[PDB]
Amino acid sequence: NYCNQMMKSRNLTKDRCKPVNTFVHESLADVQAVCSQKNVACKNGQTNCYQSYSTMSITDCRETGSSKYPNCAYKTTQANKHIIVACEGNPYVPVHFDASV
Protein backbone atom coordinates (compact mmCIF):
# COMPACT_ATOMS: atom_id res chain seq x y z
CA ASN A 1 0.00 0.00 0.00
CA TYR A 2 0.84 3.70 -0.24
CA CYS A 3 2.09 3.91 3.36
CA ASN A 4 4.45 0.94 3.24
CA GLN A 5 5.77 2.34 -0.05
CA MET A 6 6.16 6.03 0.89
CA MET A 7 7.55 5.33 4.35
CA LYS A 8 10.28 3.17 2.84
CA SER A 9 10.98 5.58 -0.03
CA ARG A 10 11.30 8.60 2.25
CA ASN A 11 13.88 6.75 4.31
CA LEU A 12 11.48 6.37 7.21
CA THR A 13 11.36 2.60 7.52
CA LYS A 14 14.68 1.55 5.99
CA ASP A 15 16.44 1.15 9.35
CA ARG A 16 13.46 0.96 11.71
CA CYS A 17 9.68 0.93 11.82
CA LYS A 18 8.26 4.36 12.68
CA PRO A 19 4.90 3.97 14.50
CA VAL A 20 3.08 6.83 12.82
CA ASN A 21 3.54 9.35 10.04
CA THR A 22 1.32 11.78 8.17
CA PHE A 23 1.75 12.84 4.55
CA VAL A 24 0.24 16.11 3.30
CA HIS A 25 -1.09 16.26 -0.29
CA GLU A 26 -1.05 20.02 -0.69
CA SER A 27 1.68 22.06 -2.36
CA LEU A 28 4.73 22.88 -0.21
CA ALA A 29 4.06 26.62 -0.42
CA ASP A 30 0.50 26.22 0.80
CA VAL A 31 1.74 24.27 3.82
CA GLN A 32 4.44 26.81 4.58
CA ALA A 33 1.73 29.45 4.44
CA VAL A 34 0.22 27.97 7.62
CA CYS A 35 3.08 29.51 9.65
CA SER A 36 1.31 32.85 9.34
CA GLN A 37 -2.22 31.57 9.99
CA LYS A 38 -4.03 30.58 13.21
CA ASN A 39 -1.63 30.75 16.16
CA VAL A 40 -2.40 28.10 18.76
CA ALA A 41 -0.47 26.20 21.43
CA CYS A 42 1.40 23.00 20.67
CA LYS A 43 0.28 20.02 22.74
CA ASN A 44 3.63 20.28 24.51
CA GLY A 45 2.57 23.71 25.75
CA GLN A 46 4.79 25.70 23.37
CA THR A 47 3.10 28.38 21.28
CA ASN A 48 4.91 28.51 17.94
CA CYS A 49 2.19 26.39 16.45
CA TYR A 50 -0.36 27.33 13.80
CA GLN A 51 -3.61 25.75 12.69
CA SER A 52 -4.59 25.87 9.03
CA TYR A 53 -7.64 27.98 8.23
CA SER A 54 -8.79 25.18 5.91
CA THR A 55 -8.70 21.39 5.89
CA MET A 56 -6.04 19.73 3.76
CA SER A 57 -5.76 16.33 2.10
CA ILE A 58 -3.67 13.95 4.17
CA THR A 59 -2.84 10.28 4.55
CA ASP A 60 -2.36 8.86 8.03
CA CYS A 61 0.09 5.93 8.23
CA ARG A 62 -0.25 3.76 11.35
CA GLU A 63 1.71 0.61 12.17
CA THR A 64 -0.43 -2.49 12.60
CA GLY A 65 -0.19 -4.40 15.87
CA SER A 66 1.76 -7.12 14.06
CA SER A 67 4.47 -4.99 12.39
CA LYS A 68 8.03 -5.78 13.47
CA TYR A 69 11.32 -4.70 11.94
CA PRO A 70 12.31 -5.50 9.23
CA ASN A 71 8.74 -6.30 8.17
CA CYS A 72 6.96 -3.04 8.95
CA ALA A 73 3.23 -3.00 8.18
CA TYR A 74 1.04 0.08 7.98
CA LYS A 75 -2.67 0.86 7.92
CA THR A 76 -3.55 3.60 5.43
CA THR A 77 -6.20 6.20 6.31
CA GLN A 78 -6.89 9.09 3.92
CA ALA A 79 -8.70 12.21 5.18
CA ASN A 80 -9.14 15.98 5.01
CA LYS A 81 -8.28 17.86 8.19
CA HIS A 82 -6.84 21.06 9.58
CA ILE A 83 -3.14 20.60 10.14
CA ILE A 84 -1.19 22.01 13.06
CA VAL A 85 2.54 22.59 12.62
CA ALA A 86 5.32 24.11 14.74
CA CYS A 87 7.24 26.85 12.95
CA GLU A 88 10.69 28.33 13.44
CA GLY A 89 13.69 29.76 11.64
CA ASN A 90 14.02 32.52 9.07
CA PRO A 91 12.17 32.17 6.84
CA TYR A 92 9.46 30.94 9.22
CA VAL A 93 8.66 27.41 8.02
CA PRO A 94 7.24 24.18 9.52
CA VAL A 95 9.75 22.00 11.38
CA HIS A 96 7.34 19.67 13.19
CA PHE A 97 3.91 18.21 12.57
CA ASP A 98 1.81 18.52 15.74
CA ALA A 99 -1.63 17.16 14.80
CA SER A 100 -4.62 17.19 12.44
CA VAL A 101 -8.18 18.08 13.41
Partner: peptide
Protein backbone atom coordinates in the same frame (compact mmCIF):
# COMPACT_ATOMS: atom_id res chain seq x y z
CA UNK B 1 23.52 17.84 6.61
CA UNK B 2 19.71 17.77 6.91
CA UNK B 3 18.10 20.83 8.53
CA UNK B 4 14.84 20.58 10.48
CA UNK B 5 12.77 22.17 7.69
CA UNK B 6 14.35 19.84 5.12
CA UNK B 7 13.47 16.85 7.28
CA UNK B 8 9.87 17.96 7.67
CA UNK B 9 9.61 18.08 3.88
CA UNK B 10 11.06 14.60 3.36
CA UNK B 11 8.90 13.12 6.09
CA UNK B 12 5.55 14.79 5.43
CA UNK B 13 5.38 16.42 2.00
CA UNK B 14 3.77 14.58 -0.90
CA UNK B 15 2.25 17.22 -3.15
Amino acid sequence: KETAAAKFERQHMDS
